[PDB]
């Protein structure tokens, strides 16, 4: 069952933007969103694709573990935190595109396509360049499709080893305190209109888990902090977090 709550539109409207938040209560098996249509509109996954990419790289042995170091290639890029060595944890934290481009090239078209079908991930279409299709290729995923994928991950039900899923969920760790844990991944899609920001993941509570997936219009990078801030207002409004 699903329920539309357009009162959340205020959180986007008060920040002069537009988007969708989708929540899923795992205990009650109920979904909630401000916009049923946009919740099912498919966009480029951009850096949210680092979740499945990590899973596949780990399960194929492209990545040995979360400690394996991927040395900087010496090419100075505009993101200072990309110009350094990374492991899976930091590559996810700083959303280091060049590291994941190399994963995909070593994964290869054939195995990447097969794995995304096995994950039932979005439209399962890797059309484009193998090292950038999630940035400007044909792959698409909706907010509700992110939920389904993330729920499988939470329950270790994806068609990779338990270890690979446990490692990726560790790398997704974003925030933890006495009240909740957030494991999540941001996304920023600019190469194809409309330009959007993503935030997908879940909130772990003592006795429940709330999966979430949001995207929002992102004409400039100035409003990137709104991906998390808007999501948290909805969570606070719904008394999921203090
Ligand atoms: Cl952990």
Q: Where does residue 156 rank: exposed (0-12), middle (13-18), buried (19+ CB within 10 A)?
A: middle
Phi, then psi, of 215 in degrees rounded to 5: -140, 160
| Contact between 142 and 122 (Cβ < 8 Å) | yes
Strand 173-176 with 209-217, pairing: unpaired
> In which residue are the tokens 């039900």 written?
157
Task: Tell me how the structure was determined.
Answer: X-ray
Q: Where does residue 193 rank: exposed (0-12), middle (13-18), buried (19+ CB within 10 A)?
A: exposed
| Contact between 51 and 172 (Cβ < 8 Å) | yes
Q: Which residues have C-beta under 5 Å from ligand 1, the single-atom ion?
A: 170
> In which residue are the tokens 């944890």 written?
89
> How far does residue 61's CA lie from ligand 1's centre (Å)?
21
Helix intervals (H) in 68-156: 88-93, 97-107, 109-118, 133-136, 143-154
d(CA 219, CA 223): 8
95: annotated binding-site residue?
yes
| Contact between 183 and 174 (Cβ < 8 Å) | yes
If one counts every other C-beta atom within 10 angstroms of the C-beta of residue 220, the result is 8
State the first-to-last Cα distance of the chain, in angstroms, to the nearest integer: 26
148: annotated binding-site residue?
no
Distances in Å between the Cα of 6 and the Cα atoms of 19, 32, 33, 234 are 11, 10, 8, 11
> How far does residue 159's CA lie from ligand 1's centre (Å)?
20
Phi, then psi, of 109 in degrees rounded to 5: -55, -50
> How far does residue 203's CA lie from ligand 1's centre (Å)?
13
d(CA 224, CA 107): 30
Q: In what order do the strands lie in the sheet with 173-176?
A: 2-4, 30-33, 19-25, 209-217, 196-204, 181-189, 173-176
> How far does residue 173's CA lie from ligand 1's centre (Å)?
6
Catalytic (active-site) positions = 47
d(CA 164, CA 218): 32
d(CA 27, CA 23): 12
> How far does residue 52's CA lie from ligand 1's centre (Å)?
17
Strand 181-189 with 173-176, pairing: antiparallel
Question: Three-class SS of residue 101?
Answer: helix
> How far does residue 144's CA lie from ligand 1's centre (Å)?
24
Chain breaks in the chain (C to N over 2.5 A) after: none
| Contact between 70 and 82 (Cβ < 8 Å) | no
d(CA 78, CA 239): 39
16: annotated binding-site residue?
no
Residues with Cβ within 8 Å of residue 241, at least 6 apart in sequence: 179, 180, 203, 232, 235
Fold topology of 1-242: Beta-lactamase (3.40.710)
Residues with Cβ within 8 Å of residue 24, at least 6 apart in sequence: 30, 31, 32, 147, 151, 210, 211, 212
Experimental structure resolution, Å: 2.4
227: annotated binding-site residue?
yes
> In which residue are the tokens 């969103």 written?
33
Q: Which residues pair with 185 in a beta bridge?
A: 200
> In which residue are the tokens 């492209």 written?
62
> In which residue are the tokens 């190399």 written?
102
**Quick one: which of 33, 42, 43, 39 has its CA closest to 9?**
33
């Amino acid at each position: 069952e699903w329920q539309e709550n357009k009162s959340w539109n205020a959180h986007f409207t008060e920040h002069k933007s537009q988007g969708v938040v989708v929540l899923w209560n795992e205990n009650k098996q109920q979904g909630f969103t401000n916009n049923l249509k946009r919740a099912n509109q498919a966009f480029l996954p951009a850096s949210t694709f680092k979740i499945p990419n990590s899973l596949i790289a780990l399960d194929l042995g492209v990545v040995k573990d979360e400690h394996q170091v991927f040395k900087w290639d010496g090419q100075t890029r505009d993101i200072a935190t990309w110009n350094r060595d990374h492991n899976l944890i930091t590559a996810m934290k700083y959303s280091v595109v060049p590291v994941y481009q190399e994963f995909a090239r070593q994964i290869g078209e054939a195995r990447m396509s097969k794995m995304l079908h096995a994950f039932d991930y979005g439209n399962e279409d890797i059309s484009g360049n193998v090292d950038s299709f999630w940035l400007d290729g044909g792959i698409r995923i909706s907010a509700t499709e992110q939920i389904s994928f993330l729920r499988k991950l939470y329950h270790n039900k994806l068609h990779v080893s338990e270890r690979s899923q446990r490692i990726v969920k560790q790398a997704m760790l974003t925030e933890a305190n006495g009240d909740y844990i957030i494991r999540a991944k941001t996304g920023y899609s600019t190469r194809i209109e409309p330009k959007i920001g993503w935030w997908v993941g879940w909130v772990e509570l003592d006795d429940n888990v709330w999966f979430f997936a949001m995207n929002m219009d992102m004409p400039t990078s100035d409003g990137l902090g709104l991906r998390q801030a808007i999501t948290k207002e909805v969570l606070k409004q719904e008394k999921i977090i203090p």
